[PDB]
Design a protein around this ligand. Structure first.
Ligand code: HEM
Ligand code: HEM
Ligand code: HEM
Ligand code: HEM
Lengths: 141, 146, 141, 146
């Protein structure tokens, strides 16, 4: 359950992210693939080189979807419902991967906005990424 | 699983720049704050009533320092990690029953703390090396299989 | 998200459980303590012998609370809200334990009602136990 | 971690009564059904369109049999589990990248399947022994640490 304080922190986080959706999105994926190699097997048709166009394009889409959840933070479900079946039913993504991606995003944020990533903000964003990925893993069964 | 020469170099390089007190206090505090149920293991630390309280708790700081110094023991001999933590394994697992999941979480917290402190120097490749290190320590701390 | 089918299966499960709340409750705890020893440390003031009065009493309370969630399956939260702070804030139960207890209950059910525990029912009850424990772990942060 | 004489006895006794095809088909099916994302590893099994379909799939049955026969190898030498699964470890972890969490889940599914089949004979003490066995196999299948 996201509290008013948590939502306020998440929005504070996104205003920092806005303007760097592609840059941060790409690095998030780059850290996912480099740190957890197994993750690459989900993208066989992707050139996984450092800053490939495909990774930048996809990284942008992913972070842009997160932006959507921030905008409709009161009801993340309906905001990302179109991605739920895609990930769980069609792609059958193993749910452990959502934690790896959430962690990867947090690392990118710590790198670029250490002062912003206070313990309190870290808590809110972790709860947020958890709720966001819960929506994408809610259609398994 | 085995550390490559590059990974060994990232680990030693970053470790050389690490202030164990500073990094350790921050990591232990964040563990207690981001994953509050872990506070059940540190009753003797006193005031853990809030983020600021935890962040300013002297016992948290001192213990955090010891935690990072321990990671330092892993750094000094990356190939002997299992042995280096065997005893601490008896302490955390056999005695305290700390569920192994928490080791991973502290590992994740440390990675984030290193990232915040080192900025762009903490590259994806550097993180990958550190992720292998924390994961190896976490594994050596869990129940010992023969 | 519990589907109409899942709720129907859970109710089907509880009608089997009704009449054996204490027996099943006690065995659930007995399997928790015997299989995952660490779990005993949460009950230092309990005589943890096979069928002690304390275990039977507590086992009954736990399964009775689950019965409450089944009755108010449309809104489990408000049904078990009084147990949320108690477990997360006051007791600071490590969340991994809720999975062990859910698993323990499923084992007890398989032992006593194999035919009832079909794959489809197994799915619904697992989703249910997950939602029930989510309520008890929602007050950590 | 080490198996006691009693645990060894529960494992061997129950194993002697296990029909590998029956138990294995049921466990693999339940794994695929209760935790559907695991289906991503068995594309070649064909029809996995529903519980009944999965439960009646001949490839699921045959593979399930092989899985249980493998657990049988653990039973035949409880002290050599790490070695017995080293190769399968390279297959599941190194090659397929099956996240270790799934090993635990299959372990949990097997325990439930044994419980349903054996009823009250599957006592808490018997389950404890089997839980140590499946957990040991799960551990031997995960990334190998030295
Ligand atoms: C924070 C959670 C995630 C968000 C918001 C999300 C976002 C989306 C977005 C918006 C797309 C493109 C959909 C469209 O254009 O049709 C997508 C595609 C995809 N996602 Fe995710 N995703 C996330 C996590 C994951 C993770 C953890 C995995 C698995 C490791 C994954 C696997 C994929 C794959 C393989 C596709 C198709 C990629 C390609 O071939 O184009 N997703 N995701
Ligand atoms: C998040 C998981 C962990 C929890 C909950 C935890 C908990 C504890 C507790 C309760 C103690 C005893 C403190 C006191 O009574 O004196 C302790 C000791 C210690 N831990 Fe951890 N621990 C965790 C992870 C780790 C990790 C990953 C390391 C790294 C090697 C580590 C290193 C140590 C060291 C070195 C000691 C002994 C310090 C001393 O002698 O003063 N711990 N831990
Ligand atoms: C399905 C989830 C659970 C339910 C519905 C639940 C149910 C409750 C109930 C109704 C009580 C008694 C409250 C009252 O009389 O004041 C209670 C107490 C307690 N619970 Fe749970 N519980 C569950 C899981 C857990 C687990 C996983 C743990 C930790 C291993 C745990 C730890 C305890 C403890 C230590 C207390 C106090 C026991 C005593 O000293 O009396 N609970 N629980
Ligand atoms: C739930 C976790 C697991 C998943 C997702 C998984 C997946 C797989 C897959 C994809 C294969 C290859 C099948 C085919 O291409 O031929 C395989 C092989 C096998 N697995 Fe698993 N597995 C899991 C757990 C286990 C466990 C715990 C055991 C027990 C020892 C086990 C035993 C085996 C055996 C013996 C083979 C080789 C069979 C053959 O040669 O025909 N697996 N597994």
């Amino acid at each position: 359950v996201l509290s008013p304080g948590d939502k306020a922190n998440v929005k504070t986080v996104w205003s920092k992210v806005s303007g760097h959706v592609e840059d941060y999105g790409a690095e998030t994926l780059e850290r996912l693939f480099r740190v957890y190699p197994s993750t690459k097997t989900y993208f066989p048709h992707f050139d996984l080189h450092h800053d490939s166009a495909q990774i930048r394009t996809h990284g942008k889409k992913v972070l842009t979807a997160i932006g959507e959840a921030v905008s409709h933070i009161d009801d993340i479900a309906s905001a990302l419902s179109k991605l739920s079946d895609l990930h769980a039913q069609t792609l059958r993504v193993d749910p452990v991967n959502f934690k790896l991606l959430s962690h990867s995003f947090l690392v990118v944020l710590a790198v670029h906005a250490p002062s912003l990533l206070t313990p309190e903000v870290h808590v809110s964003l972790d709860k947020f990424l958890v709720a966001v990925s819960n929506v994408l893993t809610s259609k398994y069964r | 699983s085995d550390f490559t020469q590059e990974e060994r170099q990232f680990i030693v390089n970053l470790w050389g720049r690490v202030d164990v007190e500073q990094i350790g206090a921050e990591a232990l505090a964040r563990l207690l704050i981001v994953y509050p149920w872990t506070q059940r293991f540190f009753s003797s630390f006193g005031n853990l009533s809030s983020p600021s309280a935890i962040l300013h708790n002297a016992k948290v700081h001192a213990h955090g320092k010891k935690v990072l110094t321990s990671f330092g023991e892993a750094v000094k001999n990356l190939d002997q990690i299992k042995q280096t933590f065997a005893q601490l394994s008896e302490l955390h697992s056999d005695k305290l029953h700390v569920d192994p999941e928490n080791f991973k979480l502290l590992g994740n917290i440390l990675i984030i703390v290193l990232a915040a402190h080192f900025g762009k120097d903490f590259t994806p490749a550097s993180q990958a090396a550190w992720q292998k290190l924390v994961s190896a320590v976490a594994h050596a701390l869990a129940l010992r299989y023969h």
